[PDB]
Ligand binder design. Structure first.
Ligand SMILES: [Mg+2]
Ligand SMILES: [Mg+2]
Lengths: 15, 388, 117, 213, 31
């Protein structure tokens, strides 16, 4: 049984 | 068994990273594109891979690798893009994320049938890793990537666990060990490869003769033709001219097969009483692959004993090859011959690296040419707005 | 009538009153009714023996090979009917039914005699 | 035919466009169209129940894409066989894949359309044909080391007669015509059974149609 | 038929098989 990875956040606070 | 550190050219990996763009722009661009359900290139994800600088960033990449496998251009995964993700993993983890992606072959589909299998294995050896080393070797067999001249290295560590295993194996374990030795064993140059092939045949013969034949080839690239025991005796009949054999582990395992079958037939309530899961279901769903004309493998047991017993005595007379040193004889193959084979792929490594560099320039100039084409079309469209 | 498709077929069209069948060998579009419009009527086939003990069959041989030449399909009974005349080789199902009759008759003969003894 | 009172119906054309537009926009995907429940043997999409002659092969085998996903480039240049040919034909039959594009709808990537080169009874064709009957749960994959074992073939010449006697009544007409016209040769007429070669029913037919030649 | 072909058919149609029969009689007697 494969569980798809959770949705991450790739937003950086630098910008 | 060790691999020389000569095949570690991180200087070339320095030149691979050339884009140097922020990951927020790349992640937002592809997420918006996927929401529209629109195809994306392998360049965009590769730029995301090449700009990895933290372990949290890799988790973003493997999530995007999973979603790019479900993108319309999944088949367009370039060799270097997978390779770059391997090198990025080897910097920080090198143990879990790479193996997990390889364990989920279908979901991610990296499929690195390159020298990176040896590189991934080598760093497992340098950190003294065994349990994960066996699993990745098995998954190389599933992808059947035992083609490079350095395939001896992979053959060694399977034999290493053969010495280390003292356990009553299961249905899957016996099949995996035979499959991980039969197909990888191709070194007709050395006797150790021949011994491994005999050892793999005996394991499959135990699998076939005890419960069934169908599951041998269900999920693995093997042959569905029955009679694996007779497929091993022919190898011992090749010693009529070939003077080299291992013959130590092969005879010991063949005796174990002989002992099991010599008790299974007379003692049905001792060895053949193990299967007790289902009776009504098994009979209703029974499938008979063999034909009536095909001789039953059970009736071939006396035939196997008669031929096998005479062969072993004959080979000792002229073969002159009976020793357990195959553990050490194979060990010195990678310690001495592999560095020459390591140098063989050094030039090939430059060739494949150079080809990737040419394609990246081709890909970048391909996108840029259309980018100016679109803006020239857009500027012309707005300068002269002609519509029906 | 305007049909979507269908293939030209030579078949038997029923006729006559009850208990007195009578088949006409006709060639019509497959999607038309059994007694409906047809292209050309070829022959006839009387299913009941007459006083002479004969079952009359009529065939328009030069026209029959014309429609077959242009790609007309044949049904099961017309193939058996043509096979008997000799225009076509005996239909394989015609022979197998014959063989089944012999075996059933052979079983019937043995079964009657076994009870006799 | 026409009359002087023809009314310009427009809704019929309007319905045709919308119906054509709807089916193109809502074209079912291959993953959801061929998804099957393995207990009731019932198709959730089409509502069809598979025949009992195909129940055994579904639970004891895998389709093409199930054995093709775990390959580097989806097995381009690989050889693929089928259980149907293996059981009935002693001669090897296999497909040499040219290109394959799966559908992304399936979470496990177990569906798609594939092309290849046909090799039936050792006879190889020189053109690429789209693979038919992909969804069937009978396909198998040959190993690398067994590739040349199955590729090797022994050509056996055909012993079927090239001529057969005419049917009796039709034979008589042939004799009658030439006798009437003056051709009195007594050579028995024969039928050229050479242009009537029939491919076996298991041979896959061309999915693509044929344009004007 | 050759025995090899008979074995192939038995495997293919296993479970729903029926009793086979030999050559038909040449002449049918009368009841
Ligand atoms: Mg009536
Ligand atoms: Mg239906």
């Amino acid at each position: 049984a494969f569980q798809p990875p959770p949705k991450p956040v790739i937003v950086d606070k630098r910008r | 068994c060790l691999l020389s550190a000569a095949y570690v050219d991180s200087h070339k990996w320095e030149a691979r990273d050339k884009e140097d763009c922020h990951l927020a722009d790349l992640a937002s661009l592809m997420d918006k594109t996927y929401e529209r359900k629109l195809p994306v290139s392998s360049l965009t994800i590769s730029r995301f891979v090449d700009n990895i600088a933290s372990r949290e960033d890799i988790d973003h990449a493997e999530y995007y690798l999973y979603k790019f496998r479900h993108s319309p251009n999944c088949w367009y995964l370039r060799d270097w893009t997978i390779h770059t993700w391997i090198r990025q993993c080897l910097k920080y983890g090198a143990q879990d994320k790479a193996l997990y992606t390889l364990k989920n072959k279908v979901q991610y589909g990296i499929f690195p049938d390159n020298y990176t299998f040896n590189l991934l294995m080598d760093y497992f050896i340098k950190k003294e890793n065994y349990k994960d080393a066996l699993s990745v070797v098995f998954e190389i067999m599933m992808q059947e990537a035992f083609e490079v001249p350095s395939t001896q290295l992979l053959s060694l560590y399977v034999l290493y666990h053969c010495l280390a295993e003292k356990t009553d194996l299961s249905w899957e374990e016996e099949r995996n060990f035979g499959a991980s030795l039969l197909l990888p064993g191709l070194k007709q140059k050395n006797s150790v490869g021949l011994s491994s092939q005999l050892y793999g045949y005996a394991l499959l013969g135990k699998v076939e003769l005890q419960q069934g034949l169908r599951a041998v080839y269900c999920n693995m690239p093997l042959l569905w033709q029955p009679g694996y025991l007779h497929r091993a005796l022919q190898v011992m009949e090749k010693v009529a001219s070939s003077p080299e054999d291992g013959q130590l582990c092969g005879e010991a395992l063949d005796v174990l097969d002989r002992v099991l079958k010599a008790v299974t037939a007379p003692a049905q309530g001792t060895s053949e009483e193990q299967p007790q899961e289902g009776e009504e279901s098994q009979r209703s769903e029974e499938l008979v692959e063999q034909l009536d004309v095909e001789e039953t493998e059970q009736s071939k047991l006396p035939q196997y004993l008669e031929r096998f017993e005479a062969l072993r005595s004959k080979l000792q007379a002229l073969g002159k090859v009976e020793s357990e040193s195959l553990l050490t004889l194979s060990t010195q193959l990678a310690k001495a011959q592999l560095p020459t084979c390591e140098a063989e792929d050094i030039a090939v490594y430059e060739q494949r690296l150079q080809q990737w560099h040419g394609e990246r320039v081709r890909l970048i100039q391909r996108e840029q040419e259309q980018r100016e084409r679109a803006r020239q079309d857009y500027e012309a469209r707005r300068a002269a707005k002609a519509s029906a | 009538r305007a049909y979507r498709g269908g293939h030209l077929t030579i078949r038997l069209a029923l006729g006559g009153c009850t208990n007195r069948p009578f088949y006409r060998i006709v060639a019509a579009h497959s999607k038309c009714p059994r007694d409906g419009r047809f292209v050309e009527q070829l022959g006839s086939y009387d299913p009941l023996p007459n006083s002479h003990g004969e079952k009359l069959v009529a065939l328009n041989f030069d026209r029959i090979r014309h429609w077959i030449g242009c790609g007309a399909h044949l049904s099961k009974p017309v193939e058996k009917l043509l096979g008997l005349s000799g225009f076509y080789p005996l239909h394989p199902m015609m022979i197998t039914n014959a063989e089944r009759l012999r075996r059933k008759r052979a079983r019937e003969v043995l079964l009657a005699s076994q009870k006799t003894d | 035919m026409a009359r002087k009172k023809v009314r310009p119906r427009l809704i019929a054309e309007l319905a045709r466009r919308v119906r054509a537009l709807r089916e193109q926009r809502e074209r079912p995907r291959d993953s959801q169209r061929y998804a099957l429940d393995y207990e009731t043997m019932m198709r959730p999409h089409s509502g069809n129940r598979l025949p009992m002659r195909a129940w055994a092969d579904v639970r004891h085998e895998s389709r093409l894409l199930q054995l093709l996903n775990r390959l580097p480039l989806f097995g381009l240049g690989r050889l693929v066989t089928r259980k149907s040919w293996l059981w009935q034909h002693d001669e090897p039959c296999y497909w040499r894949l040219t290109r394959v594009r799966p559908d992304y709808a399936a979470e496990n990537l177990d569906h798609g359309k594939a092309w290849g080169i046909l090799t039936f009874k050792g006879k190889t064709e020189s053109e690429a044909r789209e693979i038919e009957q992909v969804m069937y749960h009978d396909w198998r994959l040959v190993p690398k080391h067994e590739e040349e074992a199955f590729t090797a073939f022994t050509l056996v010449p055909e012993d079927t007669p090239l001529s057969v006697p005419y049917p009796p009544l039709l034979r008589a007409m042939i004799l009658a015509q030439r006798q009437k016209y003056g051709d009195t040769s007594t050579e028995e007429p024969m039928l050229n059974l050479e242009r009537a070669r029939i491919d076996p029913w298991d041979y896959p037919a061309k999915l693509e149609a044929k344009t004007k030649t | 038929p050759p025995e090899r072909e008979l074995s192939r058919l038995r495997r293919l149609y296993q479970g729903r098989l029926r009793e086979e029969s030999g050559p038909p009689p040449e002449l049918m007697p009368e009841v």
